[PDB]
Design an enzyme around this catalytic site. Structure first.
Site, PDB file in Angstrom:
ATOM      1  N   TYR A   1      57.997  17.064 -16.969  1.00 53.98           N
ATOM      2  CA  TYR A   1      58.489  18.126 -16.083  1.00 53.98           C
ATOM      3  C   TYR A   1      57.505  19.292 -15.961  1.00 53.98           C
ATOM      4  O   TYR A   1      57.354  19.908 -14.898  1.00 53.98           O
ATOM      5  CB  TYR A   1      59.839  18.663 -16.572  1.00 53.98           C
TER       6      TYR A   1
ATOM      7  N   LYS B   1      60.085   5.713 -25.581  1.00 58.07           N
ATOM      8  CA  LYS B   1      59.560   4.521 -24.909  1.00 58.07           C
ATOM      9  C   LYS B   1      58.349   4.078 -25.732  1.00 58.07           C
ATOM     10  O   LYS B   1      57.338   3.604 -25.184  1.00 58.07           O
ATOM     11  CB  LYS B   1      59.150   4.832 -23.469  1.00 58.07           C
TER      12      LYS B   1
ATOM     13  N   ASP C   1      65.379   2.582 -22.096  1.00 50.64           N
ATOM     14  CA  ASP C   1      65.945   1.506 -21.284  1.00 50.64           C
ATOM     15  C   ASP C   1      67.071   0.801 -22.032  1.00 50.64           C
ATOM     16  O   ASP C   1      68.020   0.296 -21.426  1.00 50.64           O
ATOM     17  CB  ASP C   1      64.858   0.476 -20.937  1.00 50.64           C
TER      18      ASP C   1
ATOM     19  N   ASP D   1      67.208  14.038 -19.295  1.00 52.64           N
ATOM     20  CA  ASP D   1      67.825  14.303 -18.000  1.00 52.64           C
ATOM     21  C   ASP D   1      68.692  13.115 -17.579  1.00 52.64           C
ATOM     22  O   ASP D   1      69.874  13.262 -17.241  1.00 52.64           O
ATOM     23  CB  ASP D   1      66.737  14.506 -16.959  1.00 52.64           C
TER      24      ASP D   1
ATOM     25  N   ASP E   1      72.976  12.637 -17.797  1.00 52.00           N
ATOM     26  CA  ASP E   1      73.699  12.357 -16.565  1.00 52.00           C
ATOM     27  C   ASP E   1      74.453  11.051 -16.679  1.00 52.00           C
ATOM     28  O   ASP E   1      75.577  10.927 -16.202  1.00 52.00           O
ATOM     29  CB  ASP E   1      72.750  12.300 -15.371  1.00 52.00           C
TER      30      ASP E   1
END
Lengths: 346, 346
Positions: free
Chosen positions: B139, B185, B217, B241, B245
């Site tokens: 970001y 990851k 994932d 993020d 959500d």
């Protein structure tokens, strides 16, 4: 109809043969002129040639119109140098055919809603096709690296890369339900704005296809809240990795998920599941994933949409009347396969 | 108990007041010396000062021990230069207080399983707390940028950054169910290995807390397939993020999701929902999110764990007795607040 078959390791060989019996019955009853040759690949190739992607198989895929691949890999080869292990072979195959679009559909067959982690009313109708860029993104971006103090990775994208995936996604949507959702992080990342704008230009050439844009975070919520409203979805590598895994849980059994890799060269159709060493040769393996992979082949490699759908329908019918072990049933590889053939023939 | 109240835009002012009623009752019948002054922020600030984070509000925040923030933003200000838009005021607020941990819990209250997109058996028991790093990652990573031919963005992370957020996560686990899942990851990206390794070291100082690692994932699948097994989850900005959500859809209504931002300065508590300009002032808005945000404030900003949980449990009792319109009920903002006050007083 030239098919290079790469059965692979574990249960690959046997599920792949299940898929081939289905194809052979279709080809025989409809005269499709199917022609195939099986080539060594994966551990099987390592054990018989010292590498995963031997020349014969390389040539074998260049000359074919499509590749039906089974499962690759297993504990028996995970300890070899990176540059010769199964997973490596898949890397060189994809690259040899410049495959850049991974196709991962997720569909809740009618009557199998109960299997979904989602409530019935929301699982019903799901039939989404997730297209994931494979060649680039942060997975390959440079610079990358790490010191004792910090690490870095780069999400980088060029216009040609986004453009080719985008095209494939629109084409796919045409032969589908004419809708495309391009997912990015445009509200915060440059590469997201770039991706967005590229997919927008490209979409201009496909007026017949409705192009919606959504953010990745928003998309994750949307696939659990209301997956049934999406048709085709295209996005970069990592988001594509996350969204397809997310969508993959919707149906409720890995042994059903087929997959495809489209690009500039020979298209690859293969099951998402692993080799499952411990049950290889025991004739228990659910061949659904490989069959549906053959169905995806019919459609995307040879444009036989209707027939593919005919195979999909029949397998859906079989998972209902004679479910395999992984669906709490007792139908083994051989028996399930005959059921599918029947439901295809009747 | 110094509380700088930043009501914001849309239905923010009114849900914020609902949370205020609840605090007022609690401070009256418990004598907690609640002190608070409301300051302009968001569009409200833009309209009365020409910017989203005016000086008075900036000083108001540094002087308070906590900030209770309502909804920020709306169509009326989206078209202004980035540097003075509402969303930017939050950026500057976060940074003024060096807030680096975003707390976003998602909980299926007993008896409200029906509300969830997930099947009953899977929704039951969910009580996950997602901790997302705020100050860095892709970001804000540089280099970033875009040419006609390509765009790039950098996922970068320094030891201190990962260290501070990790600590926060472990502390929070201690006071909870003693479990943390660090998500990355690491099986593909260097930042992922670096993040894993750093949270590993940090965890060594928290032996009492069970540290599990998972890939982002994999985590997305886990959240839909079996969210009830997670307690605390920590991860970087972007994955944070996405996972927040994703978890946020679990309860089955955004109007219930509180949130908080902890760091080196004044903590911020605010609902996750938007300003909902069309129903602003119509007294229809579900105050739940703002109240739970006030409950998180009691706990985290002032250490009143048991009291906050008294608020939460009253809130849950209310959603069952007199559900708001978004739960398919008819309890408006004022009426549902009464109900909560009641269950808290009872």
């Amino acid at each position: 109809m030239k098919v290079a078959v790469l059965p692979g390791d574990g249960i690959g060989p046997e599920v792949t043969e299940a898929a081939l019996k289905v194809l052979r019955a279709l080809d025989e009853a409809e005269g499709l002129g199917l022609a195939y040759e099986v080539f060594p690949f994966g551990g099987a190739a390592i054990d018989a040639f010292g590498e995963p992607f031997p020349e014969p198989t390389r040539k074998g895929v260049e000359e074919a119109e499509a590749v039906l691949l089974g499962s690759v890999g297993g504990p028996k080869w995970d300890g070899l140098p990176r540059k010769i292990r199964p997973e490596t072979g898949l890397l060189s195959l994809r690259k040899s055919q410049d495959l850049f679009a991974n196709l991962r559909p997720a569909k809740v067959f009618p009557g199998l809603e109960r299997l979904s982690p989602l409530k019935e009313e929301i699982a019903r109708g799901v039939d989404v096709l997730i297209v994931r860029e494979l060649t680039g993104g942060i997975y390959f971006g440079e610079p990358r690296g790490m010191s004792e103090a910090e690490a870095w990775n780069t999400e980088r994208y060029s216009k040609p890369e986004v453009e080719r995936v985008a095209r494939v996604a629109f084409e796919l949507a045409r032969k589908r339900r004419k809708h495309v959702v391009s997912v990015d992080k445009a509200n915060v990342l440059e590469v997201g704005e770039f991706w967005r704008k590229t997919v927008e230009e490209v979409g201009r050439g496909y007026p017949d296809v409705a192009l919606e844009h959504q953010y990745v975070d928003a998309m994750a919520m949307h696939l659990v809240r209301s997956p049934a409203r999406f048709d085709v979805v295209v996005t970069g590598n990592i988001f594509g990795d996350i969204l397809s895994d997310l969508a993959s849980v919707l149906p409720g059994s890995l042994g059903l998920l087929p997959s495809a890799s489209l690009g500039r060269g020979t298209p690859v159709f293969e099951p998402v599941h692993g080799s499952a060493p411990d049950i290889a040769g025991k004739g228990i393996a659910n061949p659904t994933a490989a069959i549906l992979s053959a169905a995806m082949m019919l459609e995307h490699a040879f444009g036989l949409v209707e027939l593919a759908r005919k195979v999909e329908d029949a397998v859906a019918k079989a998972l209902l009347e004679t479910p395999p072990p992984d669906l709490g049933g007792s139908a083994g590889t051989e028996a399930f396969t005959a059921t599918v053939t029947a439901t295809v023939g009747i």
